[PDB]
């Protein structure tokens, strides 16, 4: 199937004393593999997946060096943005950056991204062609001008199409035992009576990887979205994911309703019914 590598960075200013709280995390697909937390004792990029521990000291030195440079940039940004938006020193503010690449089933480059937000709102983002920028307002437009004159897009493109992909491949190989394994959802259905005339059917999927999944109901073979509730896909805590979808039905008509499950780890879509 398709794969991706993503890095997420959050910087939160600390008015009154010292530098921002800075937290960086790296993912391959839905598996976190590295982290840096400025509040932690080590001040190093740290492993969070076994297969990344295969990298030597030269890797850890370089990733620590880059990630600390990332944080210092965010630090300076928080002050610049304060100035751009005419804000005081009194409040805390947030900078977020996300970047990474997607590859298809052939592990060839599909798409790349690099986007940045201030206080939770779009600020500037590299467009799909990796050649120009989407700047949300006049502050971000000033930044676009800076980044154009420094050929930022050119550098990021080089990375997204080159390093990002080449290294995603390396990780997928090194971590194949789990990274290239799909875990099919483990499914079952529960029944609850709310009154004498109304029952709830809940269709569960558990223990699945990767996170992307589709759960739907049908009534007499027709799609049913009314009177259904679908929860946000959630982490189990052991690397796998969970989701359920429920439907409210007339008591005694349970047999009309079927739950349908699609997932990369299932060669055929799966059907469940209450009995």
């Amino acid at each position: 199937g398709s794969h991706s590598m993503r890095y997420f960075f959050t910087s939160v200013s600390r008015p009154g004393r010292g530098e921002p709280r800075f937290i960086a995390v790296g993912y391959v697909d839905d598996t976190q593999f590295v982290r840096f937390d400025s509040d932690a004792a080590s001040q190093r990029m740290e492993p969070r997946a076994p297969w990344i521990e295969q990298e030597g000291p030269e890797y850890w030195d370089g990733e620590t060096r880059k990630v600390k440079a990332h944080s210092q940039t965010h630090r300076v940004d928080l002050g610049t943005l304060r100035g751009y938006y005419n804000q005081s020193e009194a409040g805390s503010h947030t900078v977020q950056r996300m970047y990474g690449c997607d590859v298809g089933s052939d592990w060839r480059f599909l798409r790349g991204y690099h986007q940045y937000a201030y206080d939770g709102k779009d600020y500037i983002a590299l467009k799909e062609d990796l050649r120009s920028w989407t700047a949300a307002d006049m502050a971000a437009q000033t930044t676009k001008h800076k980044w154009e004159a420094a050929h930022v897009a050119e550098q990021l493109r080089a990375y997204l199409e080159g390093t990002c992909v080449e290294w995603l491949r390396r990780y997928l190989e090194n971590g194949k035992e789990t990274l290239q394994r799909t875990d099919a959802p483990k499914t079952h259905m529960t029944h609850h009576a709310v009154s004498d005339h109304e029952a709830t059917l809940r269709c569960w999927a558990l223990s699945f990887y990767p996170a992307e999944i589709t759960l739907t109901w049908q009534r007499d073979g027709e799609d049913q979205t009314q009177d259904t509730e679908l929860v946000e896909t959630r982490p189990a805590g052991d690397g796998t994911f969970q989701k359920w979808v429920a439907v409210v039905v007339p008591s005694g008509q349970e047999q009309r309703y079927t739950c349908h499950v699609q997932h990369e780890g299932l060669p055929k879509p799966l059907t469940l019914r209450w009995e």
Binding site: Y7, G26, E63, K66, V67, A69, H70, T73, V76, D77, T80, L81, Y84, R97, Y99, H114, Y116, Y123, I124, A140, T143, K146, W147, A150, V152, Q155, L156, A158, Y159, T163, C164, W167
Partner: peptide, 10 residues
């Protein structure tokens, strides 16, 4: 692997 060149101040 993190980006080496291209993380620039706003």
């Amino acid at each position: 692997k993190l980006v080496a060149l291209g993380i620039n101040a706003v």
